[PDB]
Every structure is written in C-alpha cells, then in structure tokens.
Amino acid sequence: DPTLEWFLSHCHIHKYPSKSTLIHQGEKAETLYYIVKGSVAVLIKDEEGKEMILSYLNQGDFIGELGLFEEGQERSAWVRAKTACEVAEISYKKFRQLIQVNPDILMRLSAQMARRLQVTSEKVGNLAFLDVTGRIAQTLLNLAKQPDAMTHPDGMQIKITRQEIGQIVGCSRETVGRILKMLEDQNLISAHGKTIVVYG
Amino acid sequence: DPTLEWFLSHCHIHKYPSKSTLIHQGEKAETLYYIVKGSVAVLIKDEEGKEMILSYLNQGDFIGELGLFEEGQERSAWVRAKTACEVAEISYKKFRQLIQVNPDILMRLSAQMARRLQVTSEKVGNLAFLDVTGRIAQTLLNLAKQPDAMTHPDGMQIKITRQEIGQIVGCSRETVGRILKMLEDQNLISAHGKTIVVYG
DNA sequence: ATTTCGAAAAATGAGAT
DNA sequence: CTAGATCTCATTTTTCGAAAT
DNA sequence: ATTTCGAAAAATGAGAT
DNA sequence: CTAGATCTCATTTTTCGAAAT
Ligand SMILES: Nc1ncnc2c1ncn2[C@@H]1O[C@@H]2COP(=O)(O)O[C@H]2[C@H]1O
Ligand SMILES: Nc1ncnc2c1ncn2[C@@H]1O[C@@H]2COP(=O)(O)O[C@H]2[C@H]1O
Numbered sequence: 001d002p003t004l005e006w007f008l009s010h011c012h013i014h015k016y017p018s019k020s021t022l023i024h025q026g027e028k029a030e031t032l033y034y035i036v037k038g039s040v041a042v043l044i045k046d047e048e049g050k051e052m053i054l055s056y057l058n059q060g061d062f063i064g065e066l067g068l069f070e071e072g073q074e075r076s077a078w079v080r081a082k083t084a085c086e087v088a089e090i091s092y093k094k095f096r097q098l099i100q101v102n103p104d105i106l107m108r109l110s111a112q113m114a115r116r117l118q119v120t121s122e123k124v125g126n127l128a129f130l131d132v133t134g135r136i137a138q139t140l141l142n143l144a145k146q147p148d149a150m151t152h153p154d155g156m157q158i159k160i161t162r163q164e165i166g167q168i169v170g171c172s173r174e175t176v177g178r179i180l181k182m183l184e185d186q187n188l189i190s191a192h193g194k195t196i197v198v199y200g
Numbered sequence: 201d202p203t204l205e206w207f208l209s210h211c212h213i214h215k216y217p218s219k220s221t222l223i224h225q226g227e228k229a230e231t232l233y234y235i236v237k238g239s240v241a242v243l244i245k246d247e248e249g250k251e252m253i254l255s256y257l258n259q260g261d262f263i264g265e266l267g268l269f270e271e272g273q274e275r276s277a278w279v280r281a282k283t284a285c286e287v288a289e290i291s292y293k294k295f296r297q298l299i300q301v302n303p304d305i306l307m308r309l310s311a312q313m314a315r316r317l318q319v320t321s322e323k324v325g326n327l328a329f330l331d332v333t334g335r336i337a338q339t340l341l342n343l344a345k346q347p348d349a350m351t352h353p354d355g356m357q358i359k360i361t362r363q364e365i366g367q368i369v370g371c372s373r374e375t376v377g378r379i380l381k382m383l384e385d386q387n388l389i390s391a392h393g394k395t396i397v398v399y400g
Numbered sequence: 401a402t403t404t405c406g407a408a409a410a411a412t413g414a415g416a417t
Numbered sequence: 418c419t420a421g422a423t424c425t426c427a428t429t430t431t432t433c434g435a436a437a438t
Numbered sequence: 439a440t441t442t443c444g445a446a447a448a449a450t451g452a453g454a455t
Numbered sequence: 456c457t458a459g460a461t462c463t464c465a466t467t468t469t470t471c472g473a474a475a476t
C-alpha cells in the first residue's frame with residue numbers, strides 16, 4: 001500500500017536471530033519497531049523468572065509502541081524472536097514527525113493497539129471465567145488463527161509444545177498434557193508430539 | 201485547552217444516571233464517548249452472568265473507541281455508570297472527519313489506549329503470578345488511589361463490597377471476606393461494612 | 401443538597417463439602 | 418497436597434423513595 | 439556452504455501427595 | 456469438596472553442531 005512504503009523508507013531495518021531478545025522490561029523506550037519478516041513472542045515474567053506469553057506478533061505488526069505517548073516510559077514486556085526476524089527501527093522522536101506530515105500512519109498503529117486491547121481483554125476474561133480446559137480449547141482456536149499455522153483437511157495444523165501452551169494459559173506442562181489427551185479422546189484434536197491438529 | 205473544546209463543540213452531550221448502562225457488549229459500534237464528568241465501570245460477562253471488572257474509567261477518559269478502527273465491529277464490553285455522568289458522544293464517521301482536520305485528537309486517544317494496554321497486561325500478570333491475598337492487597341492500594349477515594353485521618357478510605365472486589369481480582373465473595381479479616385488482623389486495614397480504611 | 405425513616409434489596413459469614 | 422470454590426440460610430448492611438431542612 | 443546424523447537436551451508420560 | 460500444582464523418575468522427541476558430501 002501507499003504510506004507504509006514511505007514509512008519503512010525512514011526506518012533503519014535490522015536483523016535478529018531467532019530466540020534473541022528485541023526488547024527488555026524496565027528498559028527506557030525511544031524506539032518503535034516494525035516487523036517486516038518473522039515473528040516474535042511478547043512475554044512477561046514473575047519475580048522467580050517464570051514466564052507467561054502475552055501474545056504473538058507476526059509480520060506487518062508494530063513493536064514497542066507503548067512508550068510512545070508519555071515521557072519516561074519503560075518497556076512493559078520482553079519481546080523475543082521466535083523465528084529469524086527482519087525488523088525496521090525508528091526513534092520515537094522521528095516517528096512522531098512522520099505523523100505530522102501524514103497522520104494516516106498513526107491510524108494504522110492505533111488500529112493495532114485497539115485490536116491488542118480487545119484480545120488482551122478477552123484474555124483476562126478467560127483467565128477468570130474459564131478453567132484450564134476452557135482456556136486451552138480457546139488458545140488452541142487462537143493458534144489456528146496464526147499465520148504460521150498450516151492447513152489440514154481435518155482442519156488446521158499447528159506446531160507447538162505442551163510446555164509453551166502452559167506458558168500461554170498459565171498452568172503446568174502436566175496439566176496441559178493431561179488435558180491434551182482428554183481432547184484427543186473426543187476426536188476434537190489430533191496430537192502427536194510437537195504437532196497439534198485442531199479438527200475444525 | 202482548544203483541541204478539546206473544539207472537540208466537544210462537535211459532540212452531542214448526554215447524561216446518564218448512576219448505575220445506568222451506556223454501552224451494551226455485542227452491539228454494533230458507530231459511536232465514541234468522552235467522560236466530561238463522573239465515572240464508569242468497564243465490565244464483561246460470561247454465559248452464566250458472572251461479571252468481571254476490566255477497568256474503571258473517569259473524567260477525561262475516552263469510551264467506545266475500540267470499534268472505531270475496523271468496519272463491522274461489536275462493543276467489546278459493557279460500560280455502566282458508577283456515579284451520575286455527563287458524557288460527550290460523537291459518531292465514528294463524524295470523528296473520522298475531525299481526525300483529519302487535527303490528528304492531535306487521535307494522538308490523544310491513542311495515548312489512552314496505550315495506557316489501558318499496559319494496565320490490562322499488568323492484570324494478566326497479577327492473575328497468573330499472584331495469590332488472592334496479593335491481588336486483593338494490590339487492589340485496595342489501587343482503589344485507594346482512584347480519584348473518588350476519601351481522605352482519612354489514618355490513610356485513604358473507600359466504599360466497595362466484597363462482591364465487587366472479587367470481580368476485579370477474580371475470586372468469590374467468600375474468599376474476599378476471609379482474606380479481608382486477615383488483612384485487618386495484621387493492622388493493615390480496618391473494615392467496617394462496605395467502608396474500608398487503607399492505613400497510610 | 402441532604403439527614404431522616406421505613407421498607408425492600410443486597411451483601412455477608414459460617415462451616416460443611 | 419492444598420489454595421479456593423460452592424452451597425445455604427440466618428443476619429447484617431445498604432440502598433431507595435418520599436419529606437423536611 | 440548446505441546437508442546427514444547420533445548424542446545431549448528438552449519435552450513428556452506416569453503415578454503419588 | 457476438587458481442579459491443578461508439585462515432585463520424582465523413566466521414557467520419547469528435538470535440537471544441534473561435528474562431519475560429511
Ligand atoms: N498485551 C500485549 N499484546 C501485544 N503486544 C504487547 C502487549 N503488551 C505489550 N506488548 C508489546 O510489548 C512491548 C514492550 O515494550 P513497550 O511497552 O515499549 O511496547 C510493548 C508492546 O509493543
Ligand atoms: N481492558 C479495557 N480497559 C479499559 N477500557 C476497556 C477495556 N476493554 C474495553 N474497554 C472499553 O469498553 C468499550 C466496549 O466497547 P468498545 O469496543 O466500543 O470500546 C471499549 C472501550 O471503550
């Protein structure tokens with residue numbers, strides 16, 4: 001499209017190898033990122049180092065957008081590379097300028113912020129309203145919504161570990177394992193290792 | 201300041217009494233809200249009617265924006281008045297106009313969004329990494345800092361039910377009652393009825 | 401506005417499970 | 418194993434409308 | 439350099455508390 | 456109550472960098 005080609009123009013693209021950290025919590029922020037290629041995982045930790053995945057951000061998604069509206073803001077989370085990422089970087093000071101001339105670019109940003117809020121909100125609900133099974137069924141549907149989600153005649157096909165699912169719903173790897181089978185025993189999903197198939 | 205009075209100048213003011221419903225989750229968004237005076241409660245329900253309090257919004261806070269970025273969108277949650285409010289309402293299409301005769305108004309709304317995401321994200325953390333005592337402990341401290349709290353000789357004072365408190369930390373009223381008594385045993389607060397004093 | 405007075409509606413705890 | 422969830426009524430606390438200050 | 443392969447590692451399955 | 460967390464061990468799957476092609 002128009003504007004987005006112009007934006008990237010003034011961005012300083014960089015490379016990040018999968019599993020490398022792109023953003024640190026507590027970090028002072030002055031940089032707005034943009035994922036041109038690759039995918040990351042937005043995540044937070046408890047005082048024990050334990051970690052929860054807040055979301056996954058793929059291509060065309062903005063990163064570290066939060067510290068852009070107030071002075072002295074710190075990164076609210078970590079943002080790790082899941083695959084090899086190709087991300088465009090630009091300072092807050094500069095980005096704010098790209099808006100002056102064409103506020104259509106902030107409209108793209110705001111729209112994405114809006115969406116995240118809906119999902120993060122829906123997430124808080126699941127957390128209080130559903131049990132691990134409910135939370136797991138839900139997260140499975142969400143994983144089938146991801147771009148790196150392949151296809152299967154039985155439905156959609158994803159690749160992820162019981163370990164990782166637990167960091168998403170906030171339960172144990174055991175609990176996930178117990179429940180995963182329980183779902184397979186009702187032909188709703190086809191589990192076999194690090195691969196899950198959601199019959200849909 | 202200008203940007204706002206010029207904003208209101210194009211809005212249609214409405215008044216709602218305490219406890220009335222301003223937004224019904226599920227309905228089609230086509231309107232925007234700005235709380236000129238008073239305060240509201242953002243909340244979600246489950247099929248069984250259980251209610252969860254995502255947030256409290258107050259004077260100067262925008263409402264009903266999540267739908268403003270994409271076509272065919274539904275209100276994400278219910279919004280019910282806490283106190284009597286005087287709200288400014290404007291259409292999406294009428295707002296899309298203003299944003300292009302001064303995008304400074306968009307920047308300002310995006311700013312409130314960014315903040316709600318930090319906050320909602322933090323809520324995700326709490327639910328996962330904290331025991332009910334901790335979350336409740338956390339809530340009182342916050343509520344104690346809400347614009348509608350009352351100064352107290354020994355601290356800040358608030359009026360809220362155990363019921364409601366459980367709708368913010370996600371747990372039953374029974375548990376909020378029990379934990380409440382222990383926080384008093386520890387001379388951390390004094391709870392008489394719905395009035396709770398949070399010792400400075 | 402708000403302090404009062406009598407319902408009527410809400411919100412609680414107790415302790416068993 | 419164990420934080421908490423639930424379920425039940427008998428009991429408080431509040432809320433709400435009308436009335437006066 | 440890119441591809442094939444057999445340990446260490448990471449991820450799980452089980453069963454008791 | 457009772458959904459899930461923890462712990463311990465023993466087995467499977469993956470991850471990966473040495474070696475190979
Ligand atoms: N709930 C969320 N959903 C998606 N992305 C998020 C969420 N919370 C934080 N982030 C991203 O993680 C980044 C962490 O640093 P910033 O606060 O600068 O910007 C944040 C967002 O870009
Ligand atoms: N997590 C949240 N925090 C604060 N406000 C919210 C949250 N989720 C939804 N809202 C508000 O509630 C509104 C529900 O309908 P909309 O989606 O139009 O817009 C939403 C926001 O104005």
